[PDB]
Write a protein that binds this ligand. Structure first.
Ligand code: CL
Ligand code: CL
Ligand code: CL
Ligand code: CL
Ligand code: CL
Ligand code: CL
Ligand code: CL
Ligand code: CL
Ligand code: NA
Length: 129
């Protein structure tokens, strides 16, 4: 599924990401825009041979099992394919674990390089939330 911006904001708010560990909703929408272009089916291979999956580009080295990332953990206890669903529940629940892990949203390289220190409230402007 390719989400609309306000559609995704609403879905993420429903799931309790608004101000989760202090990150306002615009941060999450911004991250999703630059990680996946709001596309749940997005996949991208990393240099290390791991793969990033879904709307928040969650990595197979640490977080999900894709059967082909040697020496990897599966800390969200989920097949990576579950992160490509039109239902974002699995992605959001896993992201909550990641962002609680010590480095906050700095775990998302696109957030750090493209969203951090910018006016992220712009990403939810005009949305009925
Ligand atoms: Cl929308
Ligand atoms: Cl947009
Ligand atoms: Cl914030
Ligand atoms: Cl915001
Ligand atoms: Cl393969
Ligand atoms: Cl694996
Ligand atoms: Cl959803
Ligand atoms: Cl933090
Ligand atoms: Na893994």
């Amino acid at each position: 599924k390719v989400f609309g911006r306000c559609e995704l904001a609403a879905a993420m708010k429903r799931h309790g990401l608004d101000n989760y560990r202090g990150y306002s909703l615009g941060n999450w929408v911004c991250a999703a825009k630059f990680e996946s272009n709001f596309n749940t089916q997005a996949t991208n291979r990393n240099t290390d041979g791991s793969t990033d999956y879904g709307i928040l580009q969650i990595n197979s080295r640490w977080w999900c099992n894709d059967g082909r990332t040697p020496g990897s953990r599966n800390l969200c206890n989920i097949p990576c394919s579950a992160l490509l669903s039109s239902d974002i529940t699995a992605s959001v629940n896993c992201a909550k674990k990641i962002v609680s892990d010590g480095n906050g949203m700095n775990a998302w390289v696109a957030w750090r390089n493209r969203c951090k220190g910018t006016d992220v409230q712009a990403w939810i402007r005009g949305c009925r939330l």
